[PDB]
Enzyme design. Sequence first.
Site, short mmCIF file in Angstrom:
data_model
loop_
_atom_site.label_atom_id
_atom_site.label_comp_id
_atom_site.label_asym_id
_atom_site.label_seq_id
_atom_site.Cartn_x
_atom_site.Cartn_y
_atom_site.Cartn_z
N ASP A 65 -50.28 -47.54 -44.09
CA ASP A 65 -50.65 -48.59 -43.48
C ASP A 65 -49.27 -49.14 -43.36
O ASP A 65 -48.52 -49.87 -44.56
CB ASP A 65 -51.14 -49.88 -43.74
CG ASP A 65 -52.71 -49.67 -43.59
OD1 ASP A 65 -52.71 -48.46 -43.57
OD2 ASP A 65 -53.62 -49.97 -44.27
N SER A 84 -53.44 -49.98 -35.61
CA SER A 84 -54.74 -49.05 -35.59
C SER A 84 -54.82 -48.12 -34.23
O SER A 84 -53.37 -47.95 -33.70
CB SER A 84 -56.06 -48.33 -36.17
OG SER A 84 -56.31 -47.88 -35.90
N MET A 85 -55.07 -48.09 -33.68
CA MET A 85 -55.34 -46.89 -31.70
C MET A 85 -54.34 -48.32 -31.55
O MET A 85 -54.80 -47.98 -30.05
CB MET A 85 -56.54 -46.66 -31.99
CG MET A 85 -57.40 -45.31 -32.91
SD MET A 85 -56.52 -44.69 -32.98
CE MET A 85 -55.55 -44.03 -31.00
N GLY A 143 -59.89 -48.91 -34.25
CA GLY A 143 -61.40 -48.66 -34.65
C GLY A 143 -61.84 -47.45 -34.92
O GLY A 143 -60.97 -46.16 -35.28
N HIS A 179 -50.88 -45.81 -38.76
CA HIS A 179 -51.56 -45.16 -40.24
C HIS A 179 -51.96 -44.19 -39.71
O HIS A 179 -52.75 -44.42 -38.80
CB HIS A 179 -52.73 -46.54 -41.19
CG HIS A 179 -53.62 -46.88 -39.86
ND1 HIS A 179 -54.54 -47.64 -41.57
CD2 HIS A 179 -54.32 -46.87 -38.90
CE1 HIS A 179 -55.90 -47.98 -40.46
NE2 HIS A 179 -55.65 -47.12 -39.51
#
Lengths: 181, 182, 178, 184, 183, 182, 180, 182, 180, 185, 180
Positions: B161, B87-88, B58, B112
């Site tokens: 990614d 992601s996070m 997010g 990423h």
Amino acid sequence: LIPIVYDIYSRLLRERIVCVMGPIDDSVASLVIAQLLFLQSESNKKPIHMYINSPGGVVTAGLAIYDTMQYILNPICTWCVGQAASMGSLLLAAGTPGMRHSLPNSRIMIHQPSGGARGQATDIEIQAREIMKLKKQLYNIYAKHTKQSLQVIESAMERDRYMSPMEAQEFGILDKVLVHP
Amino acid sequence: LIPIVAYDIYSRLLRERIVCVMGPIDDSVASLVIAQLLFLQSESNKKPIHMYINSPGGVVTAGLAIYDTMQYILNPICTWCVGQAASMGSLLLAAGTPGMRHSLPNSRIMIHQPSGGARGQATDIEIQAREIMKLKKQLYNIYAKHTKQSLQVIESAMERDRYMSPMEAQEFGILDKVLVHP
Amino acid sequence: IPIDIYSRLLRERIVCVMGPIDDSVASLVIAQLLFLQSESNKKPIHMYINSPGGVVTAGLAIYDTMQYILNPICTWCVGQAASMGSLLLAAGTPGMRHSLPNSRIMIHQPSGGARGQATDIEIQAREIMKLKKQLYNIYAKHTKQSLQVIESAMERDRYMSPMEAQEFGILDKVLVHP
Amino acid sequence: LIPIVRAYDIYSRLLRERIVCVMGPIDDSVASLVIAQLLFLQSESNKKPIHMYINSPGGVVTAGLAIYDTMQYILNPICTWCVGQAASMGSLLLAAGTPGMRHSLPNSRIMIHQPSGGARGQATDIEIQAREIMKLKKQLYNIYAKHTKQSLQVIESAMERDRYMSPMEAQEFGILDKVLVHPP
Amino acid sequence: LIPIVVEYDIYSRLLRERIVCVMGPIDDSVASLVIAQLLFLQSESNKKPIHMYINSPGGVVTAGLAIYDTMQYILNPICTWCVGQAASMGSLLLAAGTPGMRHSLPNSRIMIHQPSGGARGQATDIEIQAREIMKLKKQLYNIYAKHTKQSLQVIESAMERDRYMSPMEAQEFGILDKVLVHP
Amino acid sequence: IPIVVEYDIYSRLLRERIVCVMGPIDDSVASLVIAQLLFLQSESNKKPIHMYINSPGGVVTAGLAIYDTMQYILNPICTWCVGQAASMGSLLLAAGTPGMRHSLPNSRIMIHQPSGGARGQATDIEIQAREIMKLKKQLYNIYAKHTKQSLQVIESAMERDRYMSPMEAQEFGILDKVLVHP
Amino acid sequence: LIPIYDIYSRLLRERIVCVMGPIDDSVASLVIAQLLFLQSESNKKPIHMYINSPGGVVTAGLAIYDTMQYILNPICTWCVGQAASMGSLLLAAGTPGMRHSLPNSRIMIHQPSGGARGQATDIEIQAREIMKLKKQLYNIYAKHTKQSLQVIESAMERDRYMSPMEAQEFGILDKVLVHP
Amino acid sequence: LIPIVYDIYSRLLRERIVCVMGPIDDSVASLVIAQLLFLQSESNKKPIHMYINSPGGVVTAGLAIYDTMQYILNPICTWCVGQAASMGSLLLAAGTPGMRHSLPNSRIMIHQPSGGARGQATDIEIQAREIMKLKKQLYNIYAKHTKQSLQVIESAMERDRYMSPMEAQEFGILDKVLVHPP
Amino acid sequence: IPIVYDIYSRLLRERIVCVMGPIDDSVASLVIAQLLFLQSESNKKPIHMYINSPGGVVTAGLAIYDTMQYILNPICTWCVGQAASMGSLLLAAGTPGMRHSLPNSRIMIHQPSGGARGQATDIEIQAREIMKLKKQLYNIYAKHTKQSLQVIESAMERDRYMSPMEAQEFGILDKVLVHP
Amino acid sequence: IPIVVGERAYDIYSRLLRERIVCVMGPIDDSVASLVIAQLLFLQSESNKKPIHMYINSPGGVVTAGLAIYDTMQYILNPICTWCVGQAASMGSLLLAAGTPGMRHSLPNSRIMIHQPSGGARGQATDIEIQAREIMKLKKQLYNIYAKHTKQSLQVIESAMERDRYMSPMEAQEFGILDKVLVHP
Amino acid sequence: LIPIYDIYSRLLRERIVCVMGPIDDSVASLVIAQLLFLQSESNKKPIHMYINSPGGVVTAGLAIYDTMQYILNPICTWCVGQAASMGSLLLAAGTPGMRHSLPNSRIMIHQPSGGARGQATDIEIQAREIMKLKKQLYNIYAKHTKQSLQVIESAMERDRYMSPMEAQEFGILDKVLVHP
Ligand SMILES: [Cl-]
Ligand SMILES: [Cl-]
Ligand SMILES: [Cl-]
Ligand SMILES: [Cl-]
Ligand SMILES: [Cl-]
Ligand SMILES: [Cl-]
Ligand SMILES: [Cl-]
Ligand SMILES: [Cl-]
Ligand SMILES: [Cl-]
Ligand SMILES: [Cl-]
Ligand SMILES: [Cl-]
């Protein structure tokens, strides 16, 4: 809506008049460029009148019209009507020296280009690199036709800079503030 | 739909010092996680805190807010990756206490570079473009700090990614153990 | 919401996996299973399945939790156990997987999406095949089938009756009466 | 969506520990709750310090000024803690804390900028609303210069555009006092 | 989400302290709640003062008059406290406080203006609705001149357009009494 | 909605035998008011009931539903106009017990003939139009009964929107007292 | 609306094809129809093609590219305003020595972008053809730009904007016009 | 649909008649200016007739039509039909002195310009100065053609000022109020 | 739509103006353009105006009315279907003795309607202007029906529907024709 | 719409109008009624003696629009031959019966429907009463028009048009709406 | 999407009426108008009707059918692509021995569908009519296909698709073409 006498814009085009009205996009730019190349193909000597009443638009569309103006051999007589803001002011300033006109109650506005960017951080930096290139490319074009220094161009176009026809004449955008033919 | 044991199922876990970071991470999710991490610290500054991650990622600023709170509190933090930590969510998994970063066998870790947007004048575009570049380098230094990798490896891997299995993520330095209890 | 009936079943160590399965449903199921393991790592856990399926990563999240906890897991298919719901039905403890007579079970390869540059689409196509191979190995593990038949059956939508799913290895008993 | 810890949510539990959370965009609804919480915490004690956790991207200027006035009015010392980000009026609330009690996390983010707004109507109504947004602009600048201990020239120059700062830069500028890595 | 105390939402907790909060826009729903609270506080005690916190950009004129009437009706002294802003009918409620008990924070702002409204239908209905709006305009002007101690000619010229004031300007105009920094 | 403890602010006023008719009046609002009035009569058929009115009006059948219950219960009803009592709100204000109809000084009362719609075949239009004229005459007789006015004065005053000040409504017979203080 | 034939048809009488705006199946069909009409007039007379396109569908751009190479007439490509994505390909697809650009125009090259949906087998099928288009465009660019495959890969991996002189050095265009 | 004789507006253009109907924007301003240049190229001495039935519109579009009117040498006969409001009243007053007419039941309205402004406070101040410049620019134009002082123009245009054809003649906007052609 | 060159332009040759449908600034401008064209063709030949309008903008109807009274040509008004709101005003504006109506037509008159929004100062200006239009329309009806203002005010307070025979008795039209 | 072909292009409906044929197809509103009335007046200007053919394939529409066409049909001196194609319902049946007596035709599988008019009314009670009386007048007005051309009593018309009354071409001829039921040659 | 004299008007000059796409009142009125124009040109020359319709309104299909059977000209029906619902009725409505269809065409017949809403009295009226339309279509299909009403009831109870040879055997066609 479209009077016939042959729409009203062609009867003026037959008199070698190109109208630049409304916002400037790829549709408007392609029409103006197509008329500039056609009038050049008919004559490389007769002047071309360009009536301008545009609030602005896409930067790439304004440069497309600018390059075609600075490439046709014909002298272009620009006539500011109502208003010439954003890229419309550049086309007014890019006319043949001494042949750039404006009506008394017109108004000219200049400002730095605005744009958008979305994607990865690498893509943002690439797109922001080109937006700043267009900003300095517009500053060099304005400083060329207004005979001003880049410092004055950067300071005046940092924000929206509206000018009266007399203020634009002294700035170097146009040449004659007509009040009568 | 949240079941009741009276509390919700996540609060019954919160009494067991369990913080659930499931789903996308934004300001609302980050604020709740940080509020739980500080309430658990008030109960005890020594008891370990368990964090379960099933997040696709997010907002980067929300993920950095959780990471800062994790490193700020002196409590040991055991991170548990369930399903995926992308992601996070992968950064929160690697931000746990060294030796307490776990993951289930069929989990998935993705890293990423951050994405964003910018619109306005050319001056505003440049200010916002560098700020994304500052967040990109800030994330790369945090990843290199906890994964014990060089900046060249973090930059080359997170350019696109990068999906990793729990074994590949352990080999890369994100998590420590790939748990199997059949 | 009758006074909460799902909270009452959870008191008897019954986790209901009803409706579609997404990240929200999996988060609730995983939180209940770990809560039941914190109470006791020996008492069996009942899982009621009535799901048309959903996100694959959500089903794998529930699957890993099901295999991690030491508690025996009795799966009870009610109505339908399609897509990831069939996997959770077969992921139960061997000899404790049941299904009602008129229920049905469906299995199929995972589906997804991909959009972006040619490099990103290639990366995303890489990962959707890893999920496809990962799902096939899990189905072949619990159903006691070879990878060849699993690939041939899950290439399209494969619906099974409770007797067909028992012979295929998904479930163990087809209840008629208790 | 809020966990329940007699029972209350996680934000109400922190409020019993005298902690007010300003997290998310700041509007009239958020400001009124924050002002209501600050007034309740003062009615419980005039001496016990109040902790304000900030994770806001900003919002309405009048909403931030409403919180700022209540912060300066109440007698309780206010410890501001920037978590995540403190942008727009959120940075003003961070700098409005008690001198020496303004904290931030090492990877936080602080942004200051001039106010924005709109105006529509007759030419007379445009001039009235335009003069008001310029008074709010000078009002914010004098408030920032008061708490950051900067001159008006420095405040006017830094807030003409969006000015992003790191915790070390915001400490140097005068917005926060200390960047904490662990509880003091 | 509204926080919860355990002595109970934060506005209910302040209501026990005889504090009524007029936050956000004022409409029939907001006016009815404020009136229900003021009449409940008077039934509990007609002597204890009632505190009214104001942070409103304004709203419906009839809703503001409904609150103002209940304020002047109840015997309790009403201390008005402007936090943030008190515009449109919010400035009228701020001026409607008991004389000597009208306060405001330093960075607040007060706005007053003539009422606005709509009218549609036949020409007969337009004239009926227009006369009623003009009667509300003269009604508000008399109320402001009563509590600000100003003349009608001053009120008519000041509220013709949007008139924003600082707490020092509002105190001098007669809307509030004290501008407070620290209590 | 505030809450008391000893319970929303309207439920607390209902314990003081106070019924609030706030906002528009439809079938939902009328059913709640009638349910409270019949509940208040079950507690005591002789203790007075207070009705606070701040309504711009609404459905006519909903206003008549409240009116019927007001006149049917034996309890004396004190009507208090706050803000405005327009359309059916003015009818409920005038339907109070004679001598117990009050209004605040800056309130505003309005009366008008009922409005509505009709769509269908020509036979359906005639039936629906006849019932609207019956509601119009039914309202006029009810207003003339409680205002002690003639049918002519009621018919001519309610042909268009008729706004009244509290003193004008007292003179017209809608209310009895214009209270500047308790 | 368009000024009177029309105006684009007038330029077509002067053997001028305008590729303005985005490129799709409708735009590609019109350009190919105009190119075939100009070839039916004469099989050796030069055809002028003015480009002001921000890009579009890749398959539509390859439709114009193949038609440009198939027809015998020499194509004179003129970049006006911008020639990005497939617009740069059509600009570089001109006859060698007849690829011009205006001074303040801009050229952008980037790898193709698309999408894929469905089950894993369908995702893999559509992902192959996009990779094939990427190599196909890279081979088409490397041919006309006379660059190596590695250079085309490293240049079109991300979005690359170039000035008319930078595109001339790269090999997209041949001549940069200037103030007459 | 426009009739066919060309269209009805083109046949009138042969009789040197320019129609300014409906709202005025950039599209209407360009067509009017283009039609005014067609009549000038045919003759500089023949008078141009401009029938006006406009409620107003963009101010910059009205100033564009105004400049073309004052630029061309042809005498302009303005005829107010229906209404001439906002910039439509300025075009009516922009006619040649002695050739500004109006029908008996027409309606003339003058008012100060309106606009919008959004962005940072610096952008608000820049755009607010421009709206005030347009205000004084229109005030001097109206005062020039109505032969009124600036004091009268400011008071009359502070709000919407509606005038009958007889009032607009006395004010100086038009010259003749005709019923039938004398 | 139908050609004979629309069917309405063919009637315009016979000096026939059609006012059918709602009346706005668009319809009013077309009608006035036709009335001015027919006057330029002849100042003596009468102009026939067929009316089938449910009404519309008041200022649009006043623009048509004034143009009808301005031109010197006699105007025969023919009501077909319905002539309501401003449509009835145009019907009554015809030359005395030349206002006709088909037997099953319908005429309706009513006071004007409008709206107003803004400050109390703006409401009073717009309300005063609506009342001026109401009295202006009332004077126009009494101008052609020769009724007293008391009758015009009492009849147009509400929607007043009239049959062709009732409208003739009231004075809006002169003849109810079943056959020519 | 196709076109045919001193050399003018005619759309298919103008080609028939040149043969004195007016087509009334689809719903009937002010726009359709205006075109039909304009065509009837143009055909009368060419010749007030030559018959005018009117083809009808309409499901109905606005009542005032249908009356506008009906009055113009009765006003013009030209004999009007009505031809029902597909269906002639609501006001379409009134136009079929409005033709010259003996010249009202219909195709074998056509369909004719009659019903009382429908409408709406909104506003104050006084406005509802005015608008209700007006649709009632239109109801009695349509009943008198149908009773005139069908040669039925007003009571038979009231009983038949209370609800939707569909008729076959044979039933509509017996009722008096049309004269000849064509039989596929 | 109109190639220019358009392509459909050029086919109408050769006495060819095209019935393409769905059939509604707009399509039916055009087909009926063309059949009346082609009859005025000649009462003896045959009329060709190209059918490629998925069906539509039943009253619209009955209108075209009643126009095909009323004119004296022999109608040659040519099924192309598909002739479903009312399109199959118009196909079988051709002159006996002049109904054709291409090899890979498709013919579908099915009972009519419709809606109903209102009071119970109105529901029965509308349902009694849709049954009369159902029985009316059954008599028309049984007339031209020479099948019994019982066969038409059983075939059109559900969606009944037929190949060109199955339609010829059923009685809808006469000749299944392969080449002219
Ligand atoms: Cl040049
Ligand atoms: Cl830690
Ligand atoms: Cl297990
Ligand atoms: Cl403080
Ligand atoms: Cl008081
Ligand atoms: Cl009672
Ligand atoms: Cl070539
Ligand atoms: Cl002039
Ligand atoms: Cl006349
Ligand atoms: Cl006749
Ligand atoms: Cl035949």
